[PDB]
Design a protein around this ligand. Structure first.
Ligand code: NDP
Ligand code: NDP
Ligand code: NDP
Lengths: 246, 252, 240, 254
C-alpha cells in the first residue's frame, strides 16, 4: 500500500515510533527512522533489516534548528524525497506549574511543538512538487483533556493539533493531508516511568480496562498514510481506549 | 486457488442501506476484507440488487429488506439474520435520510421522520445485536454520522440534531460495552459524491467546493476504507471516537 | 436590570435548575413565565416568583405533546405577550443499560428532551424574527459530550440538543437571535459521592444558582456575539 | 465625595490585564474597572502605559498603566515584582497580549514562528507562574486566557498562531486541573473576528469575505469580548473551569 514511497519517522528507536517505522515498512515504504545518537541510528537500521524492511537510521535532534535543516537538506539532495513524515519524537518534563523550572517548560515546548515547524518546513517543497504527501503528528489525550503536573506537555500537544488543522488548510490543494493521532496511555518507556499505584489508577479511567500497545498506534498511523485515507485531513484521531471521548 | 485470509475473515457484518452510495461501498469493502456481508435496502428489489452486487464482486453474504425506522422490520430482519447466517459481530449503522427545511417552514413529519430514521434506528439496531457481541467478547459498532452534527447547517436542524445525537449515543454505549472488547465509533463524512449530495442544487454544490481545502467531494470508497479500518483489530484501542472524513471542510 | 421589558419563558421551572433560572431572569428584570407538567407545579411557580418579587406566571405545559405546546404558546402570544427569551430546560431520564432498556425508556427521553426543542422553537421564532432580537438557550448536560453508561438515551438526546443549537444559530443569526446551550455537570439537586467528587477539579457539586448565572449572562445584551456555543458548567469534570 | 454607589461583582479585586493599551485588552480593563476591580493594564511602551493610566482615570477607575513585554523572562519578572511591591496581588489575571506574524509555512521565517509561540504561548507560563502563589493564599483566583477561533478552526497562513492559540487552550485545561482545589478557575475566551487593529489590518476584500462566513453578519466589538471576560471573572462563573468560550458570531461552532 506504500510501495515506492519514502517515509521519515522521528523517534524510531523504541516505543510508538519504532512500531510506526516497522508498520510503514510492512506496508512497503522505504523507512528513514531517527534517533538522538549515532548508536541509536545504527540500531534502527539493523532493526529494520532484521524485520525485512528497507531503509536507514538517521541521527536527528528535532529540538535543534541546525540538526533538522542540515540533515534534511542532505537526505533530499542525495538520498530522496520523504513523502510520508511522522512527527513522533516527544518528551515529558512533569511538574506542578509552581514547581516547574524554566528549562522544563521550554524544553517540552521546543521539542514537542517547535519541532513540527522545523520538520514540516524542510519536507513541504518536495510534497508540493509531487502533488502528494502525508504528515502525521503524534499528539496525546493530555492535549484535549489536560492533566495536572503537565501544563507544558498539554500546551505543546494541544498546539500540535492547532498546527495540524492550519497546515491541512494550506496544503490541501496539493493533495497533501495533515493529521494527528492522539494516543491515550500506551505501554512504552514513557509510561513505565509513572509510579505503580498511578498506573493502577489510570486503568480505572479506561473503558477497555487495559493500556494500549504501541502496535495499535502504528496501525492507525499506517492507515492514515495510505491512499484510502486521502479524504481525511485536519483530523485528530484519538486512540485512548475510551479514556477521553470528544 | 486459496487466497490469504484478510483482516475480517469469517466475521458476520451487517451494513444498513447497502443498496447504493456510502453503504454499498462499505459492504464491498468489508467483503474485500473477508467478512460475510449482509447488506440491506428498504425494498425487495433493492435487496435482490444487493445480492447480485455481492455475488458479482465475489463476496459471501445476503441482501435483505430492512426499514430501520420500524420496530417490526428490525425485529423480523435481525431474527432472519440470526437464523440463516449467524450473529453479526460488525454492525454499520449507515441508513439515513434528509428532509431539509428552515425550522419555521418545517413540517412535523420532516422533523420526526429524520429523528426516527437517523437516531432512533441506533437504539433499534444496537439493542438487537449487543447480546451476541457481549457473549463473543468482541464486536464493532460503527455509526455513520455527518459533519453537520458538529458544524450545524441552516435548513438542517432535524438532521443536525439526529447526527449530533448519534455521536452522544456512540460515546455512551462505548462506556457500557468496553469491558467486553466491543468498540463503538462514529465516522462523520463531509460531502461525498452520492445520490444524497447529487440532490442539492448545482449552485450549492459549486459553493461547496470553495469550502473544502482538498477542492473536491469525497468518494464513497473513501468513507468505506475508514470504516473497514475501524472494523479491524488494528483499531481495537479506538472507542467512543468520531473520525471526520470531510476533506478539511471542518476541523474539530 | 439587564432584561427589563422582556418576557422570558422557562420550561421545567418548578424546582432545581429551572427554578433557579426563572428566579435569575426575574432578578434581571424579565417578566417570567415558568412551566410545569402539573397544576401543583404551575401554582408553585406563580407563588415562588411572587415570594421573590418577580413578575410572571406559572403555566401547565407538556413539552412532549405537539398539541399542548402549539396551542398553549399560541394562547400566550395572543393574550399575555411575546417571549423573546426562551429557555428549554424541561428534561427527563430513564436510565438502563441498553441491553435492558425498554422501548418507552428510549422513546420518552428522545421525545421529551430532544423533540421538545423543535416544538418550542417553532412556536416562538416568528415573534423573535419580527422583534429582530431573541435568545434561545437550551439546557443540555455534560453527559451529552462525555457519555455515561446506563444513559445512552439521555446522552443521545442531550448531544442532539447541541447539534440542534448549532444548526438553528446558523438559521436565525441574520435576525440578531442567538441560540446557545449550557451543559451542567453534577449539581446539588456517601461512598460513590466521594468517587464522583474525585472526578471534579473544584472538588464540589455545583449549585443550581451557578447554572442560572450563566444562563442569565447568555440572555443579556453582553452576550450578543456568542451564538451556536455550548458553555460547560461542570467544575472541570469535562473540558472541551 | 458624598455619593456612594453599590459595590459591583469584582469590588476591590486587584486585576492584571496584559495589552490594555488598545483593542480587546483596553475594553477588558474598562469592563473589570466598571465592575469595581483595581485595574493594572500593561503596554509595550511608556507611551501606551501613560495612555492606560489616563483612560483609567478618565473612566474613574483606580489602577495603573505599566510597561510589560510578555515575551521577555526579565520584563515579566521585574514588572510582577513591582506590582507585588507597590500595587497589590493580582487575583484576576487576563492574558490578553498577543501578536500575529502571518505567512505560508514554506515562506515562514524562523523568527516569525518563534516570536508568535514565544509571545502568545510561552507568556502563559511566565505570567501564571508569577501570580499563582497569591491566588493560592487567598483561596480564590481567576486566570482568563484570550485564545482565538483560529486555534480550533485552523487558518492558512497562520500555522504559528494556530499552534500558539490551540496550545493556550491545552494549557488552560491542564492548569485548571492543578489549581481547582484552591477555588482558582482557569478559562479561555476565543474571539472570532473582532473590530480592532489586528483585524483592521486585513485587506478589505478578505474582511468582506469573512462576513459571508459569519451567521450574525458582522464583526464583533471589543466590548463584547470584555463582557464575557467580566462575567467569567465573577463568582457567577465559579463553577466554570477549563472551559473555552467561543465568541465568534457563529463563525465556528464546536
Ligand atoms: N507512551 C504513551 O502513553 C504516550 C505517548 N505519546 C507521544 O508518543 C510519542 C512517542 O512516545 P513513546 O514511544 O512513549 O516515547 P519514548 O520516550 O519511549 O521514546 C521517545 C522517542 O523520541 C525520541 N526523541 C526524544 N527527544 C528527541 C529529540 N529531541 N529529537 C529527536 N528525537 C527525540 C527518542 O530518541 P532516543 O531513543 O534517541 O532517545 C525516542 O525514539 C511522543 O510524542 C509522546 O509524547 C502520547 C500519548 C501517550
Ligand atoms: N452523501 C453525503 O455527502 C453524506 C452522507 N452522510 C450519511 O451517510 C449515510 C449514507 O449516505 P448516502 O450514501 O449519501 O445516502 P443515499 O441516500 O445515497 O443512500 C441511503 C441508503 O440508506 C437506505 N435507507 C434510507 N432510509 C432507510 C430506512 N428507513 N431504513 C433502512 N434503510 C434506509 C437507502 O435504501 P434504499 O436504496 O432502499 O432507498 C440507501 O441504501 C447516511 O446516514 C447519510 O446521512 C453523512 C454526511 C455526508
Ligand atoms: N482582533 C481579533 O479579531 C482577535 C483577537 N484575538 C486575540 O485577542 C488578543 C487581543 O487582540 P487585539 O486587541 O485585536 O490586538 P491589538 O493588536 O489591537 O492589541 C494587542 C495588545 O497586546 C499588546 N502586546 C503585543 N505584544 C506584546 C508583548 N510582547 N508583550 C506585552 N504586550 C503585548 C499590545 O501592546 P501595545 O499597544 O504596546 O503594542 C496591545 O495592547 C490577542 O491575544 C489576539 O490574538 C483573538 C481572536 C480574534
Amino acid at each position: 500500500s506504500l510501495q515506492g514511497k519514502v517515509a521519515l519517522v522521528t523517534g524510531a528507536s523504541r516505543g510508538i515510533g519504532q512500531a510506526i517505522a516497522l508498520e510503514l515498512g510492512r506496508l512497503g515504504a522505504v523507512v528513514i527512522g531517527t534517533a538522538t545518537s549515532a548508536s541509536g541510528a545504527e540500531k534502527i537500521a539493523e532493526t529494520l533489516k532484521a524485520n525485512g524492511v528497507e531503509g536507514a537510521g538517521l541521527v536527528l535532534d528535532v529540538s535543534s534548528d541546525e540538526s533538522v535543516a542540515a540533515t534534511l537538506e542532505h537526505i533530499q539532495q542525495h538520498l530522496g524525497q520523504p513523502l510520508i513524515v511522522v512527527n513522533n519524537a516527544g518528551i515529558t518534563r512533569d511538574n506542578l506549574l509552581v514547581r516547574m523550572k524554566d528549562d522544563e517548560w521550554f524544553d517540552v515546548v521546543n521539542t514537542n511543538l517547535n519541532s513540527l515547524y522545523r520538520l514540516s518546513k524542510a519536507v513541504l517543497r518536495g510534497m508540493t512538487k509531487a502533488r502528494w504527501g502525508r504528515i502525521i503528528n503524534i499528539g496525546s489525550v493530555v492535549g484535549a483533556m489536560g492533566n495536572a503536573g503537565q501544563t507544558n506537555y498539554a500546551a505543546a500537544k494541544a498546539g500540535l493539533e492547532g498546527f495540524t488543522r492550519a497546515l491541512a488548510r494550506e496544503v490541501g490543494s496539493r493533495a497533501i493531508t495533515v493529521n494527528a493521532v492522539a494516543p491515550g496511555f500506551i505501554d512504552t518507556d514513557m509510561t513505565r516511568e509513572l509510579p505503580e499505584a498511578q498506573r493502577e489508577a489510570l486503568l480505572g479511567q479506561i473503558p477497555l480496562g487495559r493500556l494500549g500497545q504501541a502496535e495499535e498506534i502504528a496501525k492507525v498511523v499506517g492507515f492514515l498514510a495510505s491512499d484510502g485515507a486521502a479524504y481525511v485531513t485536519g483530523a485528530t484521531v484519538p486512540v485512548n481506549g475510551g479514556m477521553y471521548m470528544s
